[PDB]
Amino acid sequence: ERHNVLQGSIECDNEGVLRFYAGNGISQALSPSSLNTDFADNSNWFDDICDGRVTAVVELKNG
Amino acid sequence: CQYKIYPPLGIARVGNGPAIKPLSLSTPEVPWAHLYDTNVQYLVTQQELEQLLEEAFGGNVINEISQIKTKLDERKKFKQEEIETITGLLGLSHLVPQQQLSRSLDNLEDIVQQIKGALLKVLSDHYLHAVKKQAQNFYIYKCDNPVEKLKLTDGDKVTWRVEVANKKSFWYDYNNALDLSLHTQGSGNLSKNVSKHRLAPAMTAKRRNPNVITNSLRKQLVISSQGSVSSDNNTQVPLRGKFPANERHNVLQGSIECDNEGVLRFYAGNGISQALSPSSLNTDFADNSNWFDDICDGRVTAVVELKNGDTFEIQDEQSSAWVATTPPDYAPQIEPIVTMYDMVSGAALKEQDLDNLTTQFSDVFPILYRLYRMQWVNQADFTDNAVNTQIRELNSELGFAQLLDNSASAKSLREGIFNQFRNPLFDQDIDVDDPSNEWVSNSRIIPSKDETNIAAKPATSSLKLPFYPNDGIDYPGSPVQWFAIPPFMYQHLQNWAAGDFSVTQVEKESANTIEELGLFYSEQFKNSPNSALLCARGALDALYGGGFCPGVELTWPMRHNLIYSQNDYVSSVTPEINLLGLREFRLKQDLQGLNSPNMYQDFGHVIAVDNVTASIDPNSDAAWLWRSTPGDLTKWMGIPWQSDAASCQAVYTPEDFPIPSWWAANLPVHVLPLARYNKFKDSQSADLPEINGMTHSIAQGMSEETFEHLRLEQFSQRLDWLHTADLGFVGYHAEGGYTNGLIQMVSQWKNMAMVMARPVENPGSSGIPNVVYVAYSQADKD
Amino acid sequence: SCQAVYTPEDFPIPSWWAANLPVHVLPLARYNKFKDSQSADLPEINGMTHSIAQGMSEETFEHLRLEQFSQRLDWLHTADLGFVGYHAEGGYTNGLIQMVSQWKNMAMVMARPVENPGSSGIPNVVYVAYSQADKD
Amino acid sequence: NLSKNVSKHRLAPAMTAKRRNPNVITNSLRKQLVISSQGSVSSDNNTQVPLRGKFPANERHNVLQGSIECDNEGVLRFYAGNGISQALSPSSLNTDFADNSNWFDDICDGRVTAVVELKNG
Amino acid sequence: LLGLREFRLKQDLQGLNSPNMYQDFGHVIAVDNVTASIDPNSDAAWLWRSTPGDLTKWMGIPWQSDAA
Ligand SMILES: [Mg+2]
């Protein structure tokens, strides 16, 4: 019961560039016998697609 | 021949309750011992989890938390370190994963009561209403012929060894019992007519998981494990293999433990069945590729080491034992009409010598008693069985003892009952085509689901008893479509009908009702002095003995004497009371076990009755079939077992009644739910605010006749066992149906109703008996 | 499609339109096992031989009647809607498909008399489902 | 056509096979499952003659198994059926590659004989 | 070019009126019935002495399922 969902990963390099990777492509139902037989709408299923908000703060040497 | 293990074939049933003694069950070691026990608890109860928690909290533990006591107020949440000392002091790691034991108290805010309350919720979530495991005890007996249990003096030690395997995914499809075509003279279990007249021909069968090719790669499909425990340490040892074997899933095949007295306790697995891919669904009753389950069976041996330096190896087949795990028993107090113990008993008999069998009334009483009690699990035996109704008529006038009368004046009464029973010659109620001769039943047939819109031939003979399907189900119009008590039991019944039986006077004096005489016979078992043979019988008396399509626990090889290395009648239960007898039997065993060169044997692309025929000759390259290696007893059964169980229910005929049921004593088909019990268990005088589901005011305002009529209407409502959990039929436009049942049983088996004896304290004139058998699940509770 | 809608809780079973498309009925088979009094002048009485029916106490005889009266049968089972035979699928969808031909075979409920209910609790007028599967 | 090795090394074992339409029991009733017909034509008349049977054999369905005509040279011409296959109930679907209960088709096979009669008798 | 042959089917001369028109082997057919039919004197030899319907009865019913 309850599954870990890797929705993405983030990393920033020395120059301030952010890199965003998506998930592993894991889709699953809460019970093995729930089959995703509809093209769009299957109850009991999750996937690791996501979307959201990207913000930043720049902090200079002078404060 | 110094020491021997009993029972010679132990049985342990899967469940999701824990493998600890207080919360588990034990395979019967005395037949009939608990038939009317209204205190049984076959599902884990709230009270047992509380009492488990209280025992785990005995100081030292309170005092020592009265020291984390002080360090939390020198701090004024917990912290990991003191969390991990609260557990492991409680030692609940073996029952629930440590992770959520730890988060258990991480979320907390009489300090002892927030510990208990939080943990009991974790235990409850995992185990409340769980199917308790039924575990097998194995005993070392001293011999010469078992006299008494080995008693360990200080310095002595007994080491047990167990090796088990599961070969279902390695083995062949189950189409029907291959012995139905095997040439024979006839045994007490199976008449020679079935093969001689081709009444239900054996079908060829292909390999399961046929895409795995070469013997070498097919070994991956076999799950195996082994273990050892001794009387010097009572720590429990798991039996865990891998599937596929050396992906990879861990498979807990069982658990073993030995106490300081040298008794071995064997637990079966947790009931976990699974496919290698989520999308592989188990849509067939028997043969589903890509699946494994945790059923298993194998070899039980021991070494007895005395303080004297003398060591005794119990390793040969005459002294060693076997163990097999099986699906749960959902009505442990309801005995199958013909049992696996009856199969052993009949396998040593020749059909043409049955006229030399002698019969006591206690030899036929089991048939009538079991058939009568089938009313708690099967509608046809509650309301459509004229023998059961006649027994009821006899009980109502305290007249059951007339069935014990072997004189002519009672002959017509005995014949009237015997004549309703199906003859396992399978030669009645038939017309012969072409007298190339086929035997076509002229009684009611069980159609194939593949329909033909041509009017059925009208049946001209009445359907005989019992109303259950049998080995020949695949063949419409075969007399073997329907179950017969086997030849040697039918011969007893025949002798009884004729008057050729004996009975003692003390028996007649406890036979005014069937229940009264059943209690008497149960006392005879409990006071029999051969505890070894009673224990060997108790392991098999709860298991089914037909029909085999493939069955519930075990299947058809068990009904041949070829599978036993020894199978001898020893004595009656009582000096004067046979009760079907006590026997000494042992399975044939491969003494190399898991390391046998025959462990991975098969017959090529198909198995067929020709292979079985060849195996009769003990010199042949096929005789290994009968010399068991771990996994050999259960490999025949359905994979996963939950698909067999879901298809072990009713088989409907075009005629509504009676409804045929497969194996209803162990997999019930129609049950009396808890919800109905709560509407009939109270008498009108109960002083509660609700009385049988009515307000106090309504229940007492009605006439007493009306109150009693409502009790009996409730008692009469029998629910389809398949409806006691969500098997795919719940919800708006749910499909329901056979196949969803098989699919959902993989997860829902552990929620299906469990039948338990319960009291009715004051039945008054309602007609409800004082002991009822009530089906407990979560859906049917109210 | 106009029958039961099952909930996770077993009871009460919700039913759609049961007054015109019944869901649980009292079959003729059961009527023939409670309609007679213990004194009926018939060689078979409520599915028992005369001798067995008149051998039992009157109490248990009346109890047996009410037990038969209390057996209600799924209306969808009064004809072959795809659940009949070895390994038959059954289920909601086969019902829909088979009702096209089987609608004319489903059980029809009709008032019938009980001449001497006695103390059994069965009313003098019962409503009984007649079909061909439904017979005995 | 077939090597000895197939059987001798058990390369593809024969399976047992159950009856089609297994709910029809007794030989006498199973005769109804068989569709048959016959007819004759001669070189004195080229009218075509249908071969029409019934399924089930004595609602019944007419099954045109084929048609025969003979020309004035004495050549017989045989025509197969129209390709019509059907179940006894419309809900009976032919979901198996070979064995579908409740179905009949108009394929057929049988015996062809003749008599020659010359002027002199 | 693989040659020319004179061949004829084994035929039951009573055709539709044959006592063997409606013969079978019981609940199943198996290779053992075919073994017994090899001997033209045996009880199972009728399998090779064709009556009408005998050549096509083996094929799929209806033929359209086998074609598909
Ligand atoms: Mg049972």
Where are any strands of DSSP class E within B235-389? Answer: 237-243, 249-258, 264-268, 274-275, 291-292, 297-305, 311-314, 321-326, 359-360
User: How many CB atoms lie under 10 A from the CB of residue D79?
Assistant: 13
Q: Between B487-498 and B411-418, two packed helices, what is the crossing angle to 10 degrees?
A: 160
Q: Is the Cβ–Cβ distance between A61 and A54 less than 8 Å?
A: no
Cα–Cα distance for residue pair B420/B407, rounded to 1 Å: 21
- Report residue D36 as tokens: 């048959």
D58 half-sphere exposure, CB direction, 13 A CA radius:
3
Cα–Cα distance for residue pair B125/B319, rounded to 1 Å: 43
Cα–Cα distance for residue pair B681/B623, rounded to 1 Å: 57
Question: DSSP characters for D60-91?
Answer: -EEEEEEEEEE-TT--EEEEE-----EESSTT
Cβ of D102 within 8 Å of Cβ of B434? The answer is no
Cα–Cα distance for residue pair D66/D82, rounded to 1 Å: 8
Question: Which of E25, E27, E42, E61 to mutate: most B Cβ within 10 Å?
Answer: E27
Cα–Cα distance for residue pair B647/B662, rounded to 1 Å: 9
Radius of gyration for chain D, computed over Cα atoms and rounded to the nearest angstrom: 20
User: In which residue are the tokens 């071995």 written?
Assistant: B264
Residue D21 C-alpha, separation from nearest chain B C-alpha, in angstroms: 6
Cβ of B730 within 8 Å of Cβ of C68? The answer is no
**Number of continuous H segments (helices) and E segments (strands) in chain A:** 0, 4
- Report residue B492 as tokens: 């007893």
Q: What Å distances lie between residue B467 and B496, B524, B581, CA to CA?
A: 22, 30, 27
Residue D7 CB contacts under 8 Å (≥ 6 apart), including other chains: none
**Which residues partner with D64 through β-bridges?**
D52
Going from the Cα of B543 to the center of ligand 1, the distance in angstroms, rounded, reads 8
Going from the Cα of B135 to the center of ligand 1, the distance in angstroms, rounded, reads 16
Tell me: cis bond preceding B660? Omega within 30 of 0 counts: no
The full length of chain E comes to 68
Chain A residues with beta carbon closer than 8 angstroms to that of B726: none
User: In which residue are the tokens 């409920």 written?
Assistant: C109
Cα–Cα distance for residue pair C27/B109, rounded to 1 Å: 61
User: In which residue are the tokens 């004996």 written?
Assistant: B502
Region of residue B187 (left: phi > 0; alpha: psi -120 to 50; beta: else):
beta
- Given a contact as 3+ CB pairs under 8 Å, which chains touch B? A, C, D, E
Strand, coil or helix: B258: strand
Going from the Cα of B318 to the center of ligand 1, the distance in angstroms, rounded, reads 30
Going from the Cα of B663 to the center of ligand 1, the distance in angstroms, rounded, reads 9
Question: Which of A33, A35, A44 to mutate: most B Cβ within 10 Å?
Answer: A33
B623 half-sphere exposure, CB direction, 13 A CA radius:
10
Cβ of D24 within 8 Å of Cβ of B452? The answer is yes
- Whether B and A touch, i.e. at least 3 CB pairs below 8 A, reads as yes
Q: Has B331 been labeled as part of a binding site?
A: yes
DSSP class of residue E27 equals S
Nominal resolution in Å? 2.1
Going from the Cα of B331 to the center of ligand 1, the distance in angstroms, rounded, reads 4
Q: Which of E57, D19, D101, E23 is nearest to B478 (CA)?
A: D19
- Whether C and E touch, i.e. at least 3 CB pairs below 8 A, reads as no
Cα–Cα distance for residue pair B742/B640, rounded to 1 Å: 10
Q: Is the Cβ–Cβ distance between B590 and B629 less than 8 Å?
A: yes
Q: Is the Cβ–Cβ distance between D92 and C97 less than 8 Å?
A: no
Long-range contacts of C46-49 (CB under 8 A, 24+ apart): C47/B386, C47/B389, C48/B386, C48/B389, C48/B390, C48/B393
| Closest Cβ opposite residue D14 in set E27, E31, E55 | E31
Q: Nearest residue of D to residue E54 by CA position?
A: D109
Cα–Cα distance for residue pair B526/B32, rounded to 1 Å: 8
